[PDB]
Design a protein that fits this description.
The structure is a homodimer of 280-residue chains.
Chain A: E1 4-10, H1 19-34, E2 38-44, H2 51-59, E3 64-67, H3 75-82, E4 87-90, E5 100-104, H4 106-119, E6 125-130, H5 135-149, E7 160-163, H6 167-179, E8 186-189, H7 192-204, E9 214-218, E10 232-235, H8 239-254, E11 263-266, E12 269-270
Parallel strand pairs in A: 1-2, 1-3, 3-4, 4-5, 5-11, 6-7, 6-8, 8-9, 9-10
Antiparallel strand pairs in A: 10-12
Helix pairs in contact in A: 1-8, 4-5, 6-7
PDB class: transcription regulator
Keywords: structural genomics, new york structural genomix research consortium, nysgxrc, transcriptional regulator, PSI-2, Protein Structure Initiative, New York SGX Research Center for Structural Genomics, transcription regulator
Assembly: dimeric
Chain lengths: 280, 280
């Protein structure tokens, strides 16, 4: 026993390495530290070759691994499973057999936001999806497409919009949505940064709140938004909450229990806001 | 020899734990990893008691320490020096004897921005300082006050403005500056987040660029600003640049050389922008 845990995250795409991410790391460390375990941090070189991970796995400098930014086909989880090294995956990849994972129901989150706008009378619901190959994105995407599919709605051209997950990302997304022959009457963004962007553009044009275009944003507006509007959110869960949930599973894993049973899936909820309204 | 390095950073104030910070960590890790050394990460519990640091120092799980977010009187550097443990300080605290530190010249950065605005004909230069007890802040503050002192200018009431280092921080700072009986003709912010705030408020009122109020921001605008204006910056240096500079010093320190000589101070420069103009 070494009593060290490694957390592996890729340096690229930089944008996804944000303050909320650093916060989760922060609490991974504290909570493992509460339970007497050290946190080895391994950022992956721009390249995604994961040499230091392998080094760690071969050299056994570490008891188990925490894997951030899961992809649907993720080569480093594949490597781990293959090598029968203990790991907890923060996300869900496709793998030939069971594995230890922790994730939120993204599919359900996006669905919730569709179900809500439908119930309010909207049919032209657009969706702004982050342009990254991380599992959570496909899943939020899948939510929106499938839910729209059910209740028989062919989503119109340009309504599914891919954006670099940034305020400028959302702003331009919004600009494109507003420019279509028949613009959407409500928008969903799949992150808070896109949310603030979409929100700012709609604000500039006077189309936010009121009889204007409705908006649902995953995680609401950023803590540092310049808008004084309550944007209806898809609420996940605090970072302190998840950091502790992770340390709890790592200890259980080291206790040597079947991955089959370390599959925790938390459910997002739909919050309150001034921004989801009846279709006019 | 353990071959592990610890990096200690406090969880609070959360705001200072931003994406640029995570980026620096990212490259600390990679660059030490290039040189065969592991990165133990120790976030400090909200509390700033640094128990896990002490634990690490007592238990010797680690060869040396990297200390982030220096304060002018910082108890954990004091602890280290006292215990004759090797450490590199990312910042400059007051200490009874020499120590290994790496810092930028903040005093010089703020001075540069004052010197520049003075040379452009400004006398009513305001300053927006982050409300945190980190050494870099006092130093940027000291820059502005001293430079104004020289060239005989009593800075007017309300011109030195303290703000939570956020876009809403800068926006409100700007609102207060604009509300004074005799508002400033140029503003300096001590971080890019304040910069975007100050910049957005001035934009909303039509006072950005042109014959309007001049602006200099430390580190320019954030990568994700919604403004299409070049704000004159005080340029520091890339994160990849500093991450490598750190690993280089840690190896030198472990090579067992006098801290007296591991005192690297890089100089900020003044960049280009559309935003620093002659006083009209």
């Amino acid at each position: 026993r070494t009593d060290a845990i490694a957390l592996a995250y890729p340096s690229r795409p930089r944008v996804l390495n944000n303050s909320t991410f650093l916060e989760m790391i922060s609490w991974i460390g504290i909570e493992l530290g509460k339970r007497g375990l050290d946190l080895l941090l391994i950022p992956d070189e721009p390249g995604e070759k994961y040499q230091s991970l392998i080094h760690l796995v071969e050299t056994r400098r570490v008891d188990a691994l925490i894997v951030a930014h899961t992809q649907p086909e993720d080569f480093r989880l594949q490597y781990l499973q293959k090598q029968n090294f203990p790991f907890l995956a923060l996300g869900r990849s496709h793998l030939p057999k069971p594995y230890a994972w922790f994730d939120f129901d993204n599919h359900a989150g996006a669905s919730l936001a569709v179900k809500r706008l439908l119930e309010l009378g909207h049919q032209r619901i657009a969706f702004v999806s982050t342009d990254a190959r991380i599992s959570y994105v496909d899943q939020r995407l899948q939510g929106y497409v499938q839910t729209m599919s059910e209740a028989g709605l062919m989503p119109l051209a340009g309504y599914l919009q891919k954006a670099d997950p940034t305020r400028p990302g959302g702003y331009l997304a919004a600009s494109r949505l507003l420019a279509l022959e028949v613009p959407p009457t409500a928008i969903i963004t799949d992150c808070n940064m896109l949310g603030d962007g979409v929100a700012s553009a709609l604000d500039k044009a006077g189309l936010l709140g009121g009889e204007g275009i409705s908006l649902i944003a995953y995680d609401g507006l950023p803590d540092d938004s310049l808008l004084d509007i309550a944007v209806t959110p898809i609420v996940q869960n605090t970072r302190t909450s998840v950091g502790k949930q992770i340390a709890s599973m790592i200890c259980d894993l080291l206790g040597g229990k079947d991955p089959k049973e370390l599959q925790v899936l938390w459910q997002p909820e739909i919050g309150e806001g001034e921004t989801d309204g009846v279709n006019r």
